[PDB]
Structure 1
Amino acid sequence: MENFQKVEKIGEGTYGVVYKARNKLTGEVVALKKIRLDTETEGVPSTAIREISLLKELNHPNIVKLLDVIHTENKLYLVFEFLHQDLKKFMDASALTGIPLPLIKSYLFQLLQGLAFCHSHRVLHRDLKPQNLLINTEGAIKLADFGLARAFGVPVRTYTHEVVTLWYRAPEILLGCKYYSTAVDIWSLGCIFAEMVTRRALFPGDSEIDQLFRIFRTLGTPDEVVWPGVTSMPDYKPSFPKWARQDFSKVVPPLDEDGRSLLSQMLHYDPNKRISAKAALAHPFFQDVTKPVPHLRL
């Protein structure tokens, strides 16, 4: 740890704090996540165990790099490549002017690439929300925060203490599914795509029932023809209002006929039918993608 110059706190965590730092010997700029260590009643936290071991297999331009782990006494530091900001602040920053459509398509494209990469290496992100996506002045966007990540070479079970923030939570999880699937990650992405496009959260629920209700009001209440099995799910209620699916033309006004198609496929109810990152990359929506640079107000 002596070769690191702490520059400035850039964040907090349930098990850590993030500082920006500089390597004094190489000058490399980095993000250090510190972990205190229950060297008596816990040891290395489970989040840290999974984040480290999984992230270290995931080297991709669109995934934040874990550069080092300085494990010791009663302190654990994760050392990461460093990026300027997250999509949450960028998005806020862009309220008013809005994020240029070509930049949105670029961001979607890159996130799908990082995701497809994760998926084919059996890692589920499970916490895809604007603040967990980092960006740079060059136009790159990378997946970050693998604190809720899980390898799925063997089915991942749903647990109420490990789950995305509500707004980005898939319908199956809300309806009490037993296992997670790649689809949950594609759902979060569909929601983020719509948010960038409209400047407003897609389904900003107040609670789980409110969340499900907002999804229903927009996509329509799922029936057995749509999602064979819904009516039998653990938190499904026959009392659910029966709403109708609205025009995506009305849901996401600025998106063209192609962008609307991709979106409806990312928001598909049937998790076995929801598009995959791998497949979405094929979508005609990207047949002209480019790599614009953002105007970060750093």
Structure 2
Amino acid sequence: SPEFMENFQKVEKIGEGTYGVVYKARNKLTGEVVALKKIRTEGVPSTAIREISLLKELNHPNIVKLLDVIHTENKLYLVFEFLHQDLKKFMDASALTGIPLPLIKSYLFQLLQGLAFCHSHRVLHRDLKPQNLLINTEGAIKLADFGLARAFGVPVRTYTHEVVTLWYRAPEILLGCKYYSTAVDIWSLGCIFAEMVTRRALFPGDSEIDQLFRIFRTLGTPDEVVWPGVTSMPDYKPSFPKWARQDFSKVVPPLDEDGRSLLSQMLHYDPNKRISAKAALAHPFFQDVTKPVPHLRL
């Protein structure tokens, strides 16, 4: 202390965070491997600093641990605990068989615990996706690559106007809701739940309107009965096609009534009816939840 970038030997690139590249590095002084995320861009809004401070305050088993923050010439290096496996990579490695239900249950349960914690502390993730959910050898899964309400740094990814971060975006956001809620995270997680089960992304759209239509084609085009206020949302258009809701026996074939009940509550159109992370933890689907260790080729 202080830690200096020169104190770290870079080992290998681990991944591509939305706001910075992440490298596996070794602390030359302690031998401890860590994960370093470099963030590169002037001003930083007061609201920005406050949200970052709130996130930094969080200490939870299911949120990747930030160990230090090193400042150096317009650069910022976030020193995190080292992890190098994520749900996306894991699901792909397990594509020709799928993740075992016990592990699906465990991961979903843990993500809900992490989210419940964030939400009670006024913190939202806003950009949940398989790629940013890190897993370790002992079976934990952790939230990472948090999104941002107000910018200040630099977005290093590309997915933006592409075909990825949109796949998990809540409909209220796509329809132009200015003030959204913690419900947007539950929606993303519900999409991830379906994905772990079917082994395919639930709504892989390529544009905001395409994302909306894919959602509509599956859950039915929402109306005032199902979602009070929907027809007055900023970007709602009466010209939207009207699709009927599909049965979950078709949408997520492998799930039973308990799984379907939980998924339906996580994908409820109305944010005011969508299950909270806290309430989801008490859902019967998690009665037999355990903490299985994943089989990784590490």
TM superposition score normalised by structure 2: 0.89
* Superposed displacement of residue 257, structure 1: 1.0
Q: Deviations over 1:254-282 (max 9, x none)?
A: 11110110000000010011000011001
* Superposed displacement of residue 292, structure 1: 0.8
Contact 1:126/1:164 (<8 A) preserved: no
Q: Gaps spanning 5+ residues in structure 2: where? A: none
SS in structure 2 at match of 1:274: coil
Quick one: structure 1 residues 32 and 46, their matched pair in 2 at CA, closer, same or farther if it must change by over 3 Å? farther
* Superposed displacement of residue 247, structure 1: 1.2
Deviates more, 1:215-224 or 1:202-211: 202-211
Q: Deviations over 1:27-76 (max 9, x none)?
A: 2221111234xxxx626699985675233211000000110011233332
Quick one: structure 1 residues 75 and 47, their matched pair in 2 at CA, closer, same or farther if it must change by over 3 Å? farther
Distance in 2 separating the partners of 1:97 and 1:163: 25
Contact 2:18/2:156 (<8 A) preserved: no
The aligned residue for residue 149 of structure 2 is 149
Deviates more, 1:14-23 or 1:184-193: 14-23
* Superposed displacement of residue 286, structure 1: 0.4
Distance in 2 separating the partners of 1:58 and 1:50: 13
Distance in 2 separating the partners of 1:71 and 1:31: 16
Contact 2:248/2:260 (<8 A) preserved: yes
Contact 2:163/2:204 (<8 A) preserved: no
Distance in 2 separating the partners of 1:158 and 1:33: 17
Q: Deviations over 1:159-196 (max 9, x none)?
A: 99999811101111111111121010000000000000
Deviates more, 1:224-233 or 1:17-26: 17-26
* Superposed displacement of residue 204, structure 1: 1.1
Distance in 1 separating the partners of 2:18 and 2:283: 38
Identity over aligned pairs, percent: 100
Quick one: structure 1 residues 47 and 274, their matched pair in 2 at CA, closer, same or farther if it must change by over 3 Å? same
SS in structure 2 at match of 1:216: helix
SS in structure 1 at match of 2:147: helix
2:209 matches 1:209: yes
Contact 2:65/2:80 (<8 A) preserved: yes
Q: How does 1:1-298 map to 2 (within 5 A)?
A: 1-12=5-16, 16-36=20-40, 42=42, 49=49, 52-148=52-148, 165-298=165-298
Q: Deviations over 1:218-268 (max 9, x none)?
A: 111111111110111111111212211111121111111101100000000
Quick one: structure 1 residues 92 and 161, their matched pair in 2 at CA, closer, same or farther if it must change by over 3 Å? closer
* Superposed displacement of residue 151, structure 1: 13
* Superposed displacement of residue 20, structure 1: 0.6
Distance in 2 separating the partners of 1:276 and 1:156: 31
* Superposed displacement of residue 3, structure 1: 2.5
Contact 2:86/2:132 (<8 A) preserved: yes
Quick one: structure 1 residues 294 and 46, their matched pair in 2 at CA, closer, same or farther if it must change by over 3 Å? farther
Deviates more, 1:41-50 or 1:56-65: 41-50
Distance in 2 separating the partners of 1:29 and 1:149: 31
Contact 2:222/2:269 (<8 A) preserved: yes
Distance in 2 separating the partners of 1:163 and 1:239: 24
Quick one: structure 1 residues 68 and 48, their matched pair in 2 at CA, closer, same or farther if it must change by over 3 Å? farther
Deviates more, 1:149-158 or 1:162-171: 149-158
Deviates more, 1:284-293 or 1:53-62: 53-62
Contact 1:158/1:173 (<8 A) preserved: no
Deviates more, 1:166-175 or 1:145-154: 145-154
Distance in 2 separating the partners of 1:155 and 1:296: 30
Deviates more, 1:158-167 or 1:123-132: 158-167
SS in structure 2 at match of 1:148: coil
Quick one: structure 1 residues 130 and 149, their matched pair in 2 at CA, closer, same or farther if it must change by over 3 Å? farther
Distance in 2 separating the partners of 1:178 and 1:159: 22
TM superposition score normalised by structure 1: 0.89
Quick one: structure 1 residues 241 and 15, their matched pair in 2 at CA, closer, same or farther if it must change by over 3 Å? closer
* Larger relative contact order, structure 1 or 2 (CA cutoff 8 Å, min sep 6): 2
* Superposed displacement of residue 12, structure 1: 3.8
Q: Gaps spanning 5+ residues in structure 1: where? A: none
Quick one: structure 1 residues 43 and 8, their matched pair in 2 at CA, closer, same or farther if it must change by over 3 Å? farther
